[PDB]
Structure 1
């Protein structure tokens, strides 16, 4: 009743996504692919301005697990997003407590966003664009809320996708499962992709997978 349109969009996107790919791991491929497109965008801007990477001279994809908090982080130093981009997000999500340009948004980012809800219950976006403030955005595919980050500009430039995982999909947080999965969907990415892994007396560091 409250979110009839949102639930129907969620039902249709899940139905079509599950039918087309049949592999629930498509969420990780989208996270890798979308991060690559953001990195490619800012690298293209670099070829015309000398100091377009001043906020962050690296162009990486860094994936980190949090088995205790049940979190999955995929951080890239791509182009990032302004606050107005986060407000539009995909046009199908209503602003919190308030109950085509959006159809073109679903075309480009619908599969990437709604596939995350095959393994997650909430998606949190932390982004920083060159000409704007760092913001935190969250949604449950029904409502959304955007916030100015109290930590300030900690990303320098780029985006962090945080998925709070379902209890059924807690296996994606182990090291050997997330490392083998990233390796599969990385042979077509022209950017280094690191995974926070442990080495042995045990220290943690960025391990590059491609």
Structure 2
């Protein structure tokens, strides 16, 4: 009772016609606006990252040109009263051509475009896809942008758009070199006019940006990205704990893949995990799965620039390198513990044995 209808029944007649793939751009834009990210909030994340890059770029050229570095800041003002968000940066900024192209062309990344020339600033430039800015439209009735290029005879420009097929660009002056982005919020999104809300978002995704950051005049950071160089406040921060670390491991490596990671073991038991970053932007607040589940008591921070990220940037690409990275971490963690039950008496077992149950939890598997 076999049944197939697949047979070699075709014959191509008359020479082909050659064509070029094209795009339903408005539908692409809204696909990003309502079918790409899990939470609306990440739009902030995206914008911040843009700013970072803008700044990074600037200083790169500046550094490579023996010129002093102006104050390089990122500002977030929340206007509750007028229903808006604004993010502004002292970065390199756009010209009109750069406007039209980088903002108006979908999937264009003048950042990765910048990258394909450089390798220091290559390690901190964050964007790669060319779709992130459009996250604004998740929450925006309308987007207002003013920008001006660091380069000499630059005019200011007003690039604005409603989020649908057409953007428009007028010449605007009185724009500070860099870029300001005013977002006028949708009704169901006025919650981002809240300083407290925006604060929580930034603390969530961009708590560790390489440039000073001022929400409504208050500075944010001053929390150093320790996993790349008082593990105490860092443990009790990332693990969220009024507790302090029994055990600590700072683990950098570039054999296997580039990994910059720190692991804590906390002082209470659980009764009843980690967190993954890339280029100082949060990928998953609770990071699953890049740590064997018997090791769920451990937590802290794993970073790797060389993780392929999903288009959403909230996901690892389970291109199998990732849970083989998992395996690498299991290896160095084991070696960590056996070594630290030979550097002290303590040890591997009755020491922290609210966790011995995690290791024949361990050979459950």
Is the TM value for this pair above 0.5?
yes
1:24 aligned to 17, 40, 56, which one? 40
Separation (CA, whole Å) in 2 of partners of 1:41 and 1:72: 24
Corresponding residue for 2:209? 189
| CA shift for structure 1 position 103 | 4.5
Which residues of 2 match residues 88-103 of structure 1 at below 5 A?
88-92=101-105, 102-103=106-107
RMSD of the TM alignment (CA)?
2.2
Of structures 1 and 2, the one scoring higher in RCO (CA 8 A, sep 6+) is 1
Task: After superposition, give the CA deviation of every residue in 1:5-45 in whole Å (9 maximum; x if it has no partner).
Answer: 34321243235413xxx122110110111110111111111
- SS of equivalent residue, structure 1 residue 126: strand
Count of residue pairs the alignment pairs up: 179
**2:219 is matched with which residue?**
208
**Runs of at least 5 residues in structure 1 that lack an aligned partner in the other structure:** 93-101, 197-205
Q: Which runs of 5+ in 2 are unaligned?
A: 1-22, 111-127, 222-365
Alignment-derived partner of residue 149 in structure 2: 129
**Structure 1 stretch displaced more, 44-53 or 23-32:** 44-53
Is the 8 Å Cα contact of residues 32 and 185 (structure 1) preserved in structure 2?
no
- Taking structure 2 as the reference length, the TM-score comes to 0.46
Give the structure with higher Rg (CA). 2
Q: Deviations over 1:156-193 (max 9, x none)?
A: x2101111100111011112111122122223311011
1:133·1:153 contact (CA, 8 Å) conserved in 2? Answer: no
Structure 2 counterpart of 1:145, from 151, 157, 168: 168
Tell me the equivalent position of 1:97.
none
The question of whether the paired residues in 2 share the 8 Å contact of 1:91 and 1:105 is answered with: no
Q: Would you tell me which structure has more helix in proportion to its own residues?
A: 1
Aligned positions of 1:73-92 closer than 5 A: 73-92=86-105
